[PDB]
Amino acid sequence: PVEWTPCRPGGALCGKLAVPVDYDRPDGDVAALALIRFPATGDKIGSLVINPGGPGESGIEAALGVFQTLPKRVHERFDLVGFDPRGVASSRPAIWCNSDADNDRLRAEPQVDYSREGVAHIENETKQFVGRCVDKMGKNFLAHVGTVNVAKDLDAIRAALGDDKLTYLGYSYGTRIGSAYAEEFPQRVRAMILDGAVDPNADPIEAELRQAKGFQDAFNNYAADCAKNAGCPLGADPAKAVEVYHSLVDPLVDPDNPRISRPARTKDPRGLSYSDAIVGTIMALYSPNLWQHLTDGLSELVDNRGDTLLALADMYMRRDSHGRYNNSGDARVAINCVDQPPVTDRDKVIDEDRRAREIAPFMSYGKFTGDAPLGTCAFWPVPPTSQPHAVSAPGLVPTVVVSTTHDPATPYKAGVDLANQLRGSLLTFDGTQHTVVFQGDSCIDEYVTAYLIGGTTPPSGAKC
Ligand SMILES: *[C@](O)(C(=O)OC)[C@H](CC(C)C)NC(=O)[C@H](CCCCN)NC(=O)[C@H](Cc1ccccc1)NC(O)O
């Protein structure tokens, strides 16, 4: 049973859910899932459940940003409910590998040197890092944190809500969650919308290169706008932009020792590492809302300051004013590694490097060494709980996949194939943002509410 308690931002409820760690072993140890219920304001059909994806994103978090941008009529007919998944912030037990020192220390480095020693150093630190987890977390737990178990929890959630079928909205990784449960309880699904799609069938390397081109495309599109604007810090020449970009970012690195960071002055005591110069960029590429923020931090670097770019990185890392991180960084990795088998082969990583440098030159520093470090998950001790495959969910309600044309994170073609793999209705947004639902856009939310209450899918090839 769910005892709902107040907490402090709306008309919101709070609870926790007992779920087992191993569903094979449902008698040993139990998680407690953070929960938040926003009641409906009219006649209700049920609870809509959202998830921001990540993985790592607090469903308690998103559900408040969403609350402000929630259609009048949706609010009326649904309990908006959000939740931290198993290990997420309030959700106990939470995942902890790195300390704050651990993180700041890492981000103090430029991470560009792929010489053998430079590759040697990274994975050494990858190594010491993995031990922290198991030291502080117990290897047993880390196996069962795959989305495979998350789906079973999501099912237990619906039951806890008195819904008989589920109403769901998933962002980014949330879509990989959606598909899981979809393959799992296709009958326990009332309606479903997925935004920023993730394709389980895809090869994990090709995917990352899709994301590379996806961000360079976004970069092309930012600089094309800025270069029309007055005083573009990348010049008004969008061609030469990446160059100017590099002219602004390369000196954050000593051109004679690639381990030495020469960080830009900031009021904040940290200055700006090359690593973080790049992270803030990716940040602002996620949505055009953050592009002025970009134009700022660049003009900063022009004058040698990095304060803006420094804040974007934090927003990506979710490192608060007081310097505390939330565990979303740690969480991200743990789940990735169980969710699918890592790339064990060295050659193929080194080659992915070689290619990606060409595919996304603004991100890649200086010269291709001939070497790249293996991914973090290639060290993972608990095995992938889940397998890359095409989705097989046959008797499922028509749903709405949504992908933005120039989405840099989850590329548009991801939404394409996922929809195909679901035989469902697709919704296209012309834009260079990741996600878009309930973010000020009248058109999308019409269709969404239509499919939501009304259950009405967009036409064949609807485009807003
Ligand atoms: C999605 O779940 C989302 O937008 O959540 C914020 C999305 C799902 C796929 C991975 C796109 N996740 C992200 O975009 C995630 C951001 C989470 C930040 C909160 N602390 N970022 C990534 O997965 C990294 C994006 C990226 C890709 C290429 C180059 C640089 C950065 N992926 C890297 O870890 O590879």
Side-chain angles (χ1 to χ4, degrees):
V2 181
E3 34 199 324
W4 297 98
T5 54
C7 0
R8 199 278 201 178
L13 289 321
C14 293
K16 278 179 161 295
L17 183 53
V19 306
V21 180
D22 200 9
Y23 275 96
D24 292 357
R25 286 228 201 114
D27 186 65
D29 299 326
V30 47
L33 262 67
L35 284 177
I36 172 172
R37 198 169 115 257
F38 285 96
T41 48
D43 186 295
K44 200 176 82 149
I45 304 110
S47 310
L48 155 66
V49 180
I50 72 186
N51 176 254
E57 269 323 291
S58 172
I60 271 69
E61 278 269 3
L64 268 155
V66 181
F67 180 83
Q68 323 297 128
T69 63
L70 191 65
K72 174 52 181 169
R73 304 205 309 109
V74 169
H75 198 347
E76 307 170 343
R77 313 281 321 254
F78 288 99
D79 280 4
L80 184 51
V81 195
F83 77 122
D84 289 3
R86 50 162 65 189
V88 168
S90 20
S91 268
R92 287 295 121 72
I95 278 160
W96 287 114
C97 299
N98 268 11
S99 68
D100 295 19
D102 278 346
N103 296 328
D104 304 298
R105 282 196 288 242
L106 175 157
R107 316 167 46 181
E109 304 176 326
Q111 325 170 233
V112 304
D113 181 6
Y114 291 15
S115 76
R116 294 183 302 268
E117 182 206 0
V119 175
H121 164 88
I122 288 152
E123 321 168 284
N124 172 39
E125 274 176 358
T126 320
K127 281 185 275 182
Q128 322 141 1
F129 152 85
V130 174
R132 300 201 264 273
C133 322
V134 303
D135 164 70
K136 306 149 120 166
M137 299 286 317
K139 54 192 178 315
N140 157 77
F141 183 78
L142 306 180
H144 315 84
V145 305
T147 341
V148 58
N149 301 89
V150 181
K152 317 199 61 178
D153 310 305
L154 179 57
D155 196 63
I157 292 169
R158 191 210 75 264
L161 288 176
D163 286 8
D164 301 327
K165 281 199 210 176
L166 177 72
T167 300
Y168 179 79
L169 165 62
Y171 286 69
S172 191
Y173 177 83
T175 74
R176 146 165 282 124
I177 306 189
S179 30
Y181 187 104
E183 301 186 302
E184 241 309 330
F185 311 85
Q187 72 294 338
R188 297 289 204 179
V189 174
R190 185 181 164 270
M192 176 155 130
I193 318 90
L194 315 174
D195 190 8
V198 168
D199 183 11
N201 194 31
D203 162 76
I205 278 192
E206 304 275 55
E208 312 206 297
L209 292 157
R210 257 94 74 171
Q211 217 166 43
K213 159 92 172 321
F215 276 99
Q216 179 62 72
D217 273 359
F219 181 103
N220 302 328
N221 296 7
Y222 166 71
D225 164 274
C226 173
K228 285 180 298 282
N229 294 358
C232 189
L234 306 180
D237 200 331
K240 307 170 183 179
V242 178
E243 193 133 33
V244 181
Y245 180 79
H246 279 246
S247 83
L248 285 182
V249 288
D250 281 8
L252 290 175
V253 172
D254 200 300
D256 314 282
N257 181 3
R259 294 251 274 247
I260 304 308
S261 200
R262 296 187 311 181
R265 301 189 295 98
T266 53
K267 302 178 172 198
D268 183 300
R270 281 173 291 167
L272 187 58
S273 76
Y274 174 99
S275 72
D276 290 318
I278 304 263
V279 181
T281 303
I282 293 320
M283 206 30 180
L285 294 191
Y286 274 92
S287 182
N289 292 122
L290 319 159
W291 289 8
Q292 180 53 266
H293 287 170
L294 224 34
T295 322
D296 304 323
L298 315 182
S299 317
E300 283 173 357
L301 289 190
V302 178
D303 293 64
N304 181 310
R305 305 209 195 180
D307 292 79
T308 292
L309 294 167
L310 190 55
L312 288 178
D314 278 32
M315 197 204 300
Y316 187 93
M317 311 303 209
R318 301 297 287 281
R319 172 198 185 278
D320 80 355
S321 59
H322 297 164
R324 315 181 287 262
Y325 304 73
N326 49 48
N327 66 334
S328 61
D330 306 326
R332 219 200 328 272
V333 187
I335 315 203
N336 288 6
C337 311
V338 283
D339 274 351
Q340 84 162 344
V343 185
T344 56
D345 195 304
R346 159 82 69 187
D347 284 316
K348 320 300 186 251
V349 157
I350 297 202
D351 165 70
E352 146 161 6
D353 173 50
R354 179 207 77 90
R355 312 172 69 188
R357 285 205 141 100
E358 303 156 351
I359 277 62
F362 89 90
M363 265 184 276
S364 293
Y365 176 83
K367 263 269 294 174
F368 164 80
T369 50
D371 190 359
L374 283 166
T376 311
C377 292
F379 296 75
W380 212 243
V382 311
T385 49
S386 326
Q387 283 290 5
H389 61 191
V391 166
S392 188
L396 190 84
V397 315
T399 60
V400 201
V401 178
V402 188
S403 225
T404 315
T405 42
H406 290 269
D407 204 311
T410 52
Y412 181 54
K413 211 249 176 185
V416 171
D417 306 334
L418 179 53
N420 284 327
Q421 286 200 0
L422 296 188
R423 300 104 184 99
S425 287
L426 172 65
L427 202 43
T428 312
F429 179 69
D430 215 354
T432 321
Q433 55 182 112
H434 186 27
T435 83
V436 62
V437 172
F438 303 160
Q439 292 164 34
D441 191 313
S442 41
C443 201
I444 295 306
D445 305 354
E446 304 191 57
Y447 270 121
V448 173
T449 299
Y451 170 85
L452 262 185
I453 314 176
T456 299
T457 48
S460 145
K463 335 205 175 188
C464 268

